[model samples]
Target: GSSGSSGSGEKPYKCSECGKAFHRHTHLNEHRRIHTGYRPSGPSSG
Candidate 1:
């Protein structure tokens, strides 16, 4: 399915949980960790 965009040819991966999108697949995978109790950054809690 297509997402909202400015008609740019570039594609960004979107999260199934938050609708949050990313320009990279790795980033999208990283975002899923938020629901799995894995912190992508320093703090475990944001």
Candidate 2:
């Protein structure tokens, strides 16, 4: 079920939303908002 990379420094988790890399997915998911500014938890401040 694993498909990606072979050797060397183990780098992964390329978020399709923002072609960026992070050490963890938990952090990556949150930071993905950089380009997607989508926050259902946020208020419109209207």
Candidate 3:
């Protein structure tokens, strides 16, 4: 939300759609945008 690893943990898991880079698998697992070879949803899509 704020940023990736300001002083501690670093974002390792990188997914697709809008350069999805997360710090954990939970986010990379649950926060799925592209479900069918598509792309990230719009700003209001979320």
Candidate 4:
């Protein structure tokens, strides 16, 4: 289950908190939100 990328430039956007890389900037930001506990739905009073 370790199928990885073929080139380095394929995934440029990387998460500084976990070293996870994404193909697009949007995806990278979404993943970053996980580190910061950002949710789109529901109340944000947690």
lDDT of each: 0.75, 0.74, 0.67, 0.78
lDDT of 3 by residue, 1-46 (tens): 5866557855778776567777878878776744444545655853
TM-score of 3: 0.39
Clashes of each: 0, 0, 0, 0
Q: How accurate is candidate 3 locally (lDDT)?
A: 0.67
TM-score of each model, paired residue for residue: 0.49, 0.43, 0.39, 0.53
Give the TM-score (vs. native) of candidate 4: 0.53
Provide the lDDT at 39 for model 1: 50
**Residue 38 in model 2: shift from native, Å?**
4.3
* Model 3 alpha-carbon drift over 4 Å, by segment: 1-10, 33-46
- Write candidate 2's Cα lDDT for 1-46 as tens digits: 9987767684477777756788888888788777687766766564
Best by TM-score: 4
Residue range 1-46, candidate 4, lDDT tens digits: 8987877765677788977888889988877777997767767554
Q: What's the C-alpha lDDT at position 3 in model 2?
A: 89
Question: What ranking emerges by TM-score with the best candidate at the front?
Answer: 4, 1, 2, 3
